[PDB]
Amino acid sequence: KQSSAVSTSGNLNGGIAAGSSGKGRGAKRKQQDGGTTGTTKKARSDPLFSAQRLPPHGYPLEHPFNKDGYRYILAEPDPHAPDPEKLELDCWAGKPIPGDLYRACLYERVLLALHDRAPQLKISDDRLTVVGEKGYSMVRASHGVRKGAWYFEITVDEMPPDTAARLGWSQPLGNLQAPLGYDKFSYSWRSKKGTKFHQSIGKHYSSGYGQGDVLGFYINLPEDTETAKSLPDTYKDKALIKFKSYLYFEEKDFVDKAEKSLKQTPHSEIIFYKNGVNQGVAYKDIFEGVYFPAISLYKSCTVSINFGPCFKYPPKDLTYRPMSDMGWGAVVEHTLADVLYHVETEVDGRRSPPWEP
Amino acid sequence: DGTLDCISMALTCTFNRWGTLLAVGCNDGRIVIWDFLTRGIAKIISAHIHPVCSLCWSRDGHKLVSASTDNIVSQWDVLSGDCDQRFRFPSPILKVQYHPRDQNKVLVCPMKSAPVMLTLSDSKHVVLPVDDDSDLNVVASFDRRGEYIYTGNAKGKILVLKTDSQDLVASFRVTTGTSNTTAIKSIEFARKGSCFLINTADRIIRVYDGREILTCGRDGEPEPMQKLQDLVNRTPWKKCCFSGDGEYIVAGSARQHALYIWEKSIGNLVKILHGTRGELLLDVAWHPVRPIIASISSGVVSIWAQNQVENWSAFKELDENVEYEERESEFDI
Amino acid sequence: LPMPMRFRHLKKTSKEAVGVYRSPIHGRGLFCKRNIDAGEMVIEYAGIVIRSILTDKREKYYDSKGIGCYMFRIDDSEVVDATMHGNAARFINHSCEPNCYSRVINIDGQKHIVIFAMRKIYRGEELTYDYKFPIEDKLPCNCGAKKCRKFLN
Ligand SMILES: Nc1ncnc2c1ncn2[C@@H]1O[C@H](CSCC[C@H](N)C(=O)O)[C@@H](O)[C@H]1O
Ligand SMILES: Nc1ncnc2c1ncn2[C@@H]1O[C@H](CSCC[C@H](N)C(=O)O)[C@@H](O)[C@H]1O
Ligand SMILES: [Zn+2]
Ligand SMILES: [Zn+2]
């Protein structure tokens, strides 16, 4: 309400368009020894310190979850995107590409991302179950599908009568306080009777659900060709912030789409299984945009997502991919995204192979 | 909490059977029968030239017994105001009391002599017995039904007689704790149930249940239902009374012109009402079927009511914030 | 004093501290019945604590019923809706010069919107605070203050 000037918080200011290329002037270059963060190349220890795990569900206490179309991710220093070699005779040959950052994820495996949960959403990493207290809420996994066919599961550990979880997929723009299907960008199942919920509309084109159901979830979206028919460029936003005691990265998320025309992604579908037994097709009409597996809680619902290598009734398809596979695929993809952005800003020129892949 | 300018020299008041009228005595010796609903005086009776210090309604409400300071007792029809009967005694009368179940009969507590029970049909009188023969100051009262007579002396002795035979049906002396007696200031009963109270010279009100005295027999040790006092100020009580139901008890601190309100079962102090620091508290009464309390102080009457949450607070009124209970289909179509 | 203890005291004294009467500001409003000190708890805007996402569904609902919305934003996630269930705080007018101010407190985990006194408020005074209503395109104000914006918005 003042002017096109300094950011809304004096805690950290990013370089405005008039202060272009202003890197986040957060912590000073003068660091303390510390000792705990003095890991070297000879030691074998994961620098991403996961919090203490507790059998009772807990809350991430100092994480400002996504809002206003503003995505929030973990940050690590990464003082140099590694390009160190011998001192070449030409002192103007190589570029260090000092991004001084990375999207390192606080996860041993592809799990339910804590960055995209509601403040009323509790997790227990003993089974990575998710639970709530009042009404409905939504959580999502770490990964997100953009093409191909894949598959995961949800295991339900507690379903009292006043406890009805919902399980399915949701694109970004999905308000994580809504019950996973209240908008047109989410398609789920209600875990009282198998009922497909989308646009808050319930449809009985489905089988029946059981209290101890280990439910399999198969979903096939077309390649990014039929998804976009154009450039699927991924120019990323990256902003450095130093929240109360830790460094984090902000990126710009998508905006609420007013899409009211139906253009289904070609040959995309969703299939639901009960313990591998085909519960049937859920949604053939699938809108564009990346999707991610999501779970909605009612009052005190206990469910958990699960990947493929520890499966119970897996499909024997050679094309579908477990949660972990697409997870590390997207992780490596965002690594290359950081690489390319630091290249763009740091070294003149860019170049990519024969487009098709 | 609301006074009346239309009456002067208020000295003693008495509710009718249903708490609709209030007969107040005045220093001129007049009865002012004032109405609650119309909030106006209903009748004026030239009772005595002498102020009236004792007033009681009849059960039908058509008779009022009045006692002048001239030792002149007189019965008056409330519709006409005529002196139905008139009697005079020695040892000026301290109190009169219609019999609750026989308005023909009326007990009278005089100053120095024993209380005597008279009838209106026949101008006879039955002198009630006195234990110690030397009290010279014994208050007496009918019970709720008029079946027994409770007489308390200046020496803490308490006799329960039967109203018809005057035979000693129970007895006990109250204690000051250690070993001493105390002047029985007054005996009050509940219009509902059987709990009654005693105001004594120790400034300590003692609440009992008459059945326990009856089963205690003569010369026993009945404990009170409750013991009530101002542990803070140690204030005497000029006049006390139950609530209409009998679960609230009020005492009038004439020392500081205040009103203490305790409960019956627990006995904890409900509240305190403060009057004009310059007013001398004289008389206290409770509305028999309302949380309304009449006070007579320095010849002026004040009214103390108690209202509910409504009269402006009645959407659906709530007191504290309510977390909405979201449903399963709360977002469903 | 502890916010819980202060809140208990406020909920005990609220019924006898304030009243509602005919108001020269507009219609009926909240007046002071006992001299209120500065910063002390005047009144809770008690009501139905709901989440923000359910506001519109309620609002349109009231819009379908012709019943005025009595909602105050607790925060970006919660709202006290007093349209159907509330307290006397639904009769606090606004003044550009308020002797009161709204603050959100946390008691035992639940948030309460309490109007406290910006200054020492005396008996008979009408209670008013800053609604801080965003600028629309116009509600005239009759608060009587010399600094009055002529419009809440
Ligand atoms: N300061 C002010 N200036 C102009 N209008 C005001 C006002 N304060 C309150 N109002 C009006 O009064 C209404 C209060 S809703 C209460 C209705 C009415 N006063 C009653 O007591 O029944 C609002 O809708 C608003 O339009
Ligand atoms: N300065 C102002 N101008 C116009 N309306 C106002 C106002 N201040 C308060 N209001 C009214 O206050 C209401 C919201 S809260 C209601 C409090 C109001 N005193 C009452 O008696 O109901 C609105 O409907 C609006 O009509
Ligand atoms: Zn104003
Ligand atoms: Zn104003």
| Residues B31-61: b if buried by 16+ CB within 10 A, e if exposed | bbbbebeeeebbbebebbebbbbbbbbbeee
Q: How far is the CA of C93 from the centre of ligand 2 (A)?
A: 5
Q: Can you read off the two tokens belonging to residue B183?
A: 């002047």
B97 touches B106 (CB < 8 A): yes
- Main-chain dihedrals φ then ψ at residue C83, nearest 5 degrees: -55, -55
C49: Cβ contacts below 8 Å, ≥ 6 apart: B321, B322, B323, B324, C74, C78, C79, C80, C110, C111
Sequence-distant (6+) residues with CB within 8 A of C85 are B315, B316, B317, B318, B322, C47, C48
Q: Measure the CA–CA gap between B286 and B290, rounded to whole angstroms.
A: 8
From the alpha carbon of C94, which atom of ligand 1 is closest?
1
> Beta-carbon neighbour count of residue B180 at 10 Å?
10
Spatial distance between the Cα atoms of A23 and A26, rounded to a whole number of angstroms: 9
Q: What are phi and psi of A153, to 5 degrees?
A: -145, 165
Say if ligand 2 is within 6 A of residue C103 CB. Answer: no
The technique is cryo-EM
Tokens of A334: 């965002």
Residue partners of A9: CB distance under 8 A and separation at least 6: none
C143 labelled ligand-binding = yes
Name the residue type at position A25.
Answer: R
Q: Please check whether residue C43 touches B, CB under 8 A.
A: no
What tokens does A2 get? Answer: 């003042």
Task: Kindly state if the Cβ of C143 falls inside 6 Å of ligand 2.
Answer: yes
Tokens 């004792």 belong to which residue?
B54
A135 contacts on C by Cβ (under 8 Å): 51
Resolution of this structure in Å = 6.2
CB atoms within 10 A of CB A263: 9
The b/e string for C55-84 (b: 16+ C-beta within 10 A; e otherwise) is beebeeebeeeeeeebbbebeeebbbbbbb
- Give yes or no for a contact between B116 and B108, defined as CB atoms under 8 angstroms apart: yes
Whether B5 and chain C come into contact, CB under 8 Å, resolves to no
CA distance A178 to chain C (A): 8
Span from the CA of B322 to the centroid of ligand 2 (angstroms):
23
Cβ neighbours for B326, distance < 8 A, ≥ 6 positions apart: A134, A135, A136, A299, C51, C54
CA distance C109 to chain A (A): 12
Of C50, C85, C112, Cβ closest to residue B318: C85
Report which protein residue has its CA nearest ligand 1's atom 17.
C27
How many angstroms separate the CA atoms of A272 and A266, rounded? 19
| CA-based nearest distance B274→chain C, Å | 17
What tokens appear for B330 in the block? 């709360």
Distance separating alpha carbons of residues A314 and A308, to the nearest angstrom: 7
Whether the Cβ atoms of residue C141 and residue C149 lie closer than 8 Å to each other: yes
Q: Which two tokens stand for residue A124?
A: 């227990």
Q: What are the φ/ψ torsions at residue A325 (nearest 5 degrees)?
A: -65, -55
Look at A299 and B326 and tell me if their CB atoms are within 8 Å. Answer: yes
C9, C49, C71, C81: best mutation site toward chain B, by most B Cβ within 10 Å?
A: C49
> Hey, whose CA ends up nearest to atom 18 of ligand 2?
C91
Q: Give every CB contact of residue C57 below 8 A, 6+ residues apart in sequence.
A: none
**Exposure class string for A197-222: b at 16+ Cβ within 10 A, else e:** bbebebeeebbebeeebbbbbbbbbb
Cα separation values, C124 from A61, B231, C35, C121, Å? 46, 37, 8, 9
CA angle, B68 as apex, B66 and B69 as ends, to 5°? 150
Report the alpha-carbon distance of residue A269 to residue A282 in Å, rounded: 8
Distance CA B260, CA B263 (A): 10
- Whether residue C28 is annotated as binding a ligand: the answer is yes
A interface test, pick of C49, C53, C77, C79 with most A CB neighbours within 10 Å: C53
Of C28, C73, C94, the residue with max ligand 2 atoms within 8 A of its CB, to mutate for a pocket test, comes to: C94
Atom of ligand 1 at shortest range from CA of C91: 16
CA distance B157 to B148: 16
